[PDB]
Amino acid sequence: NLTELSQQLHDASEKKQLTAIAALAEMGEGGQGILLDYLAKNVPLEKPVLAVGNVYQTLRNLEQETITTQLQRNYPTGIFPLQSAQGIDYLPLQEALGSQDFETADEITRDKLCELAGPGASQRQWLYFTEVEKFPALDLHTINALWWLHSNGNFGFSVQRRLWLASGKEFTKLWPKIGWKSGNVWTRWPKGFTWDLSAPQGHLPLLNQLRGVRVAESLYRHPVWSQYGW
Numbered sequence: 001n002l003t004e005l006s007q008q009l010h011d012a013s014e015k016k017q018l019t020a021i022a023a024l025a026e027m028g029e030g031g032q033g034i035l036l037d038y039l040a041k042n043v044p045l046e047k048p049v050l051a052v053g054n055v056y057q058t059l060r061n062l063e064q065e066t067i068t069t070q071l072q073r074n075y076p077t078g079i080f081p082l083q084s085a086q087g088i089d090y091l092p093l094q095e096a097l098g099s100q101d102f103e104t105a106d107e108i109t110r111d112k113l114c115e116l117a118g119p120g121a122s123q124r125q126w127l128y129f130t131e132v133e134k135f136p137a138l139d140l141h142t143i144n145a146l147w148w149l150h151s152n153g154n155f156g157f158s159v160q161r162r163l164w165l166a167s168g169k170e171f172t173k174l175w176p177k178i179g180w181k182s183g184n185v186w187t188r189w190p191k192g193f194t195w196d197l198s199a200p201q202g203h204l205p206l207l208n209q210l211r212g213v214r215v216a217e218s219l220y221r222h223p224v225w226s227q228y229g230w
């Protein structure tokens, strides 16, 4: 029933929205038209809204010519403002995430964090924890919003942070939870990682532990998360 499923999407229960979206996407032109109209009334986002990301990404994932064309024409930069306190271009990150190319998105995210830190980090291609502490909140918000909106809330530094808090801030308990260690075995980069949504919650983006936890801790303690309600 398209009428009842559209009503379910326009009601306020997020869990019932998500089931309606999945059902509508499998109902051809009528269901997909309801989803496209929903996007049109809710994009561009101001605050990240998981349902809106799920609608967009569900439609992208159909990989049908006309819907893909319509989405690219109407939302050429995606559904979320690509804002940067340093004028950085986040469209390549958005494009990788919209394609569900999470490995590429992980690589781009690492490159952008170095670019955000400055020439020293870009030259050495890794970060000092103090550079992380001084990141502008706006860029971290954009980066995280993209990861979260294009992963049904499963990926993002905000997701890792809340799992870390749930672990009593014990990093040795966090790694197994997000799939970065299995018992004694560190997950080998890149081939050991799971570059798709079957991965555990918080699996991406990656934070190499070769130089210790200081960068990750500085990132999870950064004021962006409380400031933007993550």
Ligand SMILES: C=CC1=C(C)/C(=C/c2[nH]c(/C=C3N=C(/C=C4\NC(=O)[C@H](C)\C4=C\C)C(C)=C\3CCC(=O)O)c(CCC(=O)O)c2C)NC1=O
Binding pocket: 126, 175, 180, 181, 186, 187, 188, 189, 206, 207, 208, 209, 210
């Ligand atoms: C938490 C698990 C874990 C994560 C998240 C991980 C991610 C990760 N590891 C490497 C590289 C790497 N990782 C290692 C080794 C290791 N790195 C480690 O975190 C463990 C402690 C390890 C033990 C041998 C090495 C040697 C590289 C290559 C560094 C280089 O060649 O410059 C890279 C490429 C970026 C970079 O070089 O900094 C990523 C994204 N590897 C992991 O094992």
Ligand SMILES: [Cl-]
Binding pocket: 127, 128, 129, 130, 211, 214, 215
């Ligand atoms: Cl450091």
